[PDB]
Design a protein around this ligand. Structure first.
Ligand code: HEM
Ligand code: HEM
Ligand SMILES: C[C@H](O)[C@H](O)[C@H]1CNc2nc(N)[nH]c(=O)c2N1
Ligand SMILES: C[C@H](O)[C@H](O)[C@H]1CNc2nc(N)[nH]c(=O)c2N1
Ligand SMILES: O=c1[nH]c2cc(Cl)ccc2o1
Ligand SMILES: O=c1[nH]c2cc(Cl)ccc2o1
Lengths: 416, 416
């Protein structure tokens, strides 16, 4: 009938019925980073018609069923037209409106996103007519420019040509549009973003000139029509950055830290009505903790925690002193302070959490559920201090959906 | 063959093979508080022999297989003796050594416990010969006294008579041995521990005299041999408490806060070799965040966060100011400072996390795995600041195991 869901903070109860529309798929794979269930791999043959048509019809019904004032006439016509297109072409092209609807629903269906209250506010760039890498690059630049909007960040997505037979896939090898390089310096020490070590090397192996700095913006590695990836440097004028300053600690800027203002996922796949889009970069704005906690404090990243500790005069040699808790908060304060001062959009984790709670409440009232991955929705700091922590959630895959993809360099067949 | 497990912090890889010995058991029930899979309900008939014997043999093999220098001779004898006891009595009695081994293994197999590095260090009190509530009370007092040890906390467990036919179950109605009462005051305001509202009332409905205070230690509600529960007040001399003081904020003690030093689970069930023990209270020592973050800062608990905020002179009306992050840390500092000052055992969450990481490493080397519930192992604060956050985990039920039980007052048949 329905799964009961409880919020131990307010005591409120919710009835999840939306999970019934969930898709497919050896203990409980609880904290697995990239599970196969969330990954949509490559293909070497077109989608079997017996599979395509059913999913296509399913989607067309969802699209027309979303309207307040039904359009039965148009609905029936679309159903017939789509079927014919599949019969005569082996696939089908979404109408601009359908695609727009799809991108928003896929975001709406992203269990790991805390910013889904903004789901309906998304600019869509239709690049399904793209043909070359140079063209992809131009589209991406236009995207970055529009999204950055001089600090007033705007959520957007660029949709490239859908997968045909799987041999002509459009793909962005980057994990994110804007990302810093990681260098394995001569003196053994790691420089820049340690998480991009391998990818940085690949860029170098493709002709990119390494600048061996702490914040070197990596180039776009674009794969068009299944062909070999081309390297393109992102024009610096398009990469907006924020220099890190603390409202009280003047020595904070002496750290020489900064970060980009545009968080943009670049390697995911959009699934809709049986169709797959291997290239569809999208972006939103930052939530403070991503930079201050993950990027700056993870040991596998910039690992600046101990340094900020000493500077504060804390007992960095005694864990029980809770110096780490004290340091990380000041870094978070710095990140938020800097973005606000430099007029660049950002939201603290507390405001974000509440916003999601409101969204979830809205989703249950609208469709009886909201797919949520607790492990990702709970901030990397102040866990139980946020309401999301006390909220029971159900994680399930719907459609449309944004899937992970296998690393392109592991399945790509080089032309030369 | 084996499930691959990765630690994104150190990059280390682990091979889990232990999950193959997992037991039994509609989307992914990710953040469910009390799932049925972790609950072992009541019975009205003895364990079917066809089920009992197999589990019994399985356990006896595990027990003897744990020894370094094997005791094949004794092993075979025990196997035969257990079988006969079941044939002639319909069940079997564990030897003291077996039970001791069982309690430690069940703890070792608790996916939600961060303190499992101490698994082998556990005192066992055999109360399987208990008969009356008064006797249960005496055993519990002895437990509390031994465990408290004048602040030098010691982990212990008291094992009551195993379930026979399910109609003569020994049960502790309390969720924890020591817990504060929650009163629904006349002026509408909640007083004490808001989480014990319902249970507090039940105690009152059974003859307990409410003292309407902020920290009133609830009485023991004991059920012996399936009979009606009796109320027993815990002797105050046995309840050690810590008054909350801040190392710098002198106004902190003006808050009049305090907490008990003994964390003891009282309502869980021990499953071993087909046998079930509905009453087996156990305890360890506190990890700071349980008191400072959950008990003191949860809105459904003492909710002292805003109060500590103003006292600090923070912008408690602006979420983005991160006042909550600042306040909660000082409370955590207070809790740790007070326990240490009053010589009462306690461990901060950072030291606890590392300790578990070492344990997990030890478990994979010893038996190729360690059942872990990421959602419970990650501290309520400083999530990603701890190593546990970046460690992938596999959650599964082994045997022996500590299961949850259905609330006794919901299935109990009152005598009069
Ligand atoms: C408007 C502001 C937005 C905010 C503040 C936001 C924030 C977040 C955060 C904090 C995460 C976790 C990232 C990580 O830990 O790696 C996340 C994940 C995600 N978001 Fe959002 N998001 C926003 C917009 C978007 C948009 C526009 C889309 C899609 C059209 C979206 C799709 C997703 C997806 C698919 C994930 C999962 C990525 C992964 O698993 O690596 N988000 N988001
Ligand atoms: C030696 C110190 C110990 C520490 C610091 C420790 C700490 C913890 C913590 C932090 C939790 C989470 C509690 C919550 O959020 O409600 C937990 C859960 C648990 N612990 Fe430990 N523990 C210790 C000893 C023990 C012992 C001696 C046993 C068993 C013999 C044990 C069995 C468990 C079980 C079964 C749970 C789950 C309880 C539940 O799900 O409500 N722990 N422990
Ligand atoms: C192992 C663990 O799943 C991993 O480190 C996680 C958990 N929670 C997360 N939560 C978010 N938001 N983002 C992440 O990258 C992760 N990583
Ligand atoms: C809904 C959610 O599962 C619940 O609030 C949790 C999550 N994580 C937890 N973690 C621990 N250690 N203890 C808890 O009580 C909880 N509760
Ligand atoms: O903080 C953020 N903002 C984000 C926007 C996208 Cl699209 C993904 C992850 C994010 O993390
Ligand atoms: O902090 C703690 N210590 C604990 C000991 C047991 Cl047995 C259970 C939960 C605990 O939480």
């Amino acid at each position: 009938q329905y799964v009961r869901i409880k919020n131990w903070g307010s005591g409120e109860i919710l009835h999840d019925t939306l999970h019934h529309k969930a898709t497919s798929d050896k203990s409980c794979l609880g904290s697995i980073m990239n599970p196969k269930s969330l990954t949509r791999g490559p293909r070497d043959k077109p989608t079997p018609l017996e599979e395509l048509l059913p999913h296509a019809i399913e989607f067309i019904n969802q699209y027309y069923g979303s309207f307040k004032e039904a359009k039965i006439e148009e609905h029936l016509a679309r159903l017939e037209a789509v079927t014919k297109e599949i019969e005569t072409t082996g696939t089908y092209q979404l109408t601009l409106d359908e695609l727009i609807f799809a991108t928003k629903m896929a975001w709406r269906n992203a269990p790991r996103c805390i910013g889904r209250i903004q789901w309906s506010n998304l600019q869509v760039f239709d690049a399904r007519n793209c043909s070359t890498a140079q063209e992809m690059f131009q589209h991406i630049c236009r995207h970055i420019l529009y999204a950055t909007n001089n600090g007033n960040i705007r959520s957007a997505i660029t949709v490239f040509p859908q997968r045909s037979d799987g041999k002509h896939d459009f793909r962005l090898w980057n994990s994110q549009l804007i990302r810093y390089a990681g260098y394995q310096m001569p003196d053994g020490t790691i420089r820049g973003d340690a998480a991009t070590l391998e990818f940085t090397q690949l860029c170098i192996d493709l002709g990119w000139k390494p600048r061996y700095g702490r914040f070197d913006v990596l180039p776009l590695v674009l794969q068009a029509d299944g062909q070999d990836p081309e390297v393109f440097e992102i024009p610096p004028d398009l990469v907006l950055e924020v220099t890190m300053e603390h409202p009280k600690y003047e020595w904070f800027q002496e750290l020489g830290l900064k970060w980009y203002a545009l968080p943009a996922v670049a390697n995911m796949l959009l699934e809709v009505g049986g169709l797959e889009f291997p290239a569809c970069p999208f972006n939103g704005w930052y939530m403070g903790t991503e930079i201050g906690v993950r990027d700056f404090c993870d040991t596998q990243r910039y690992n600046i925690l101990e340094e900020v500790g000493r500077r504060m005069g804390l007992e960095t040699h005694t864990l029980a002193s809770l110096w780490k808790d004290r340091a990380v908060t000041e870094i978070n304060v710095a990140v938020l302070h800097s973005f606000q001062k430099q007029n660049v959009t950002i939201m603290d984790h507390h405001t974000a959490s509440e916003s999601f709670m409101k969204h979830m409440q809205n989703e249950y009232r609208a469709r009886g559920g909201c797919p949520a991955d607790w492990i990702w929705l709970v901030p990397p700091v102040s866990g139980s201090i946020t309401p999301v922590f006390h909220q029971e959630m159900l994680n399930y895959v719907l459609s449309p959906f944004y899937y992970y993809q296998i690393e392109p360099w592991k399945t790509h067949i080089w032309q030369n």
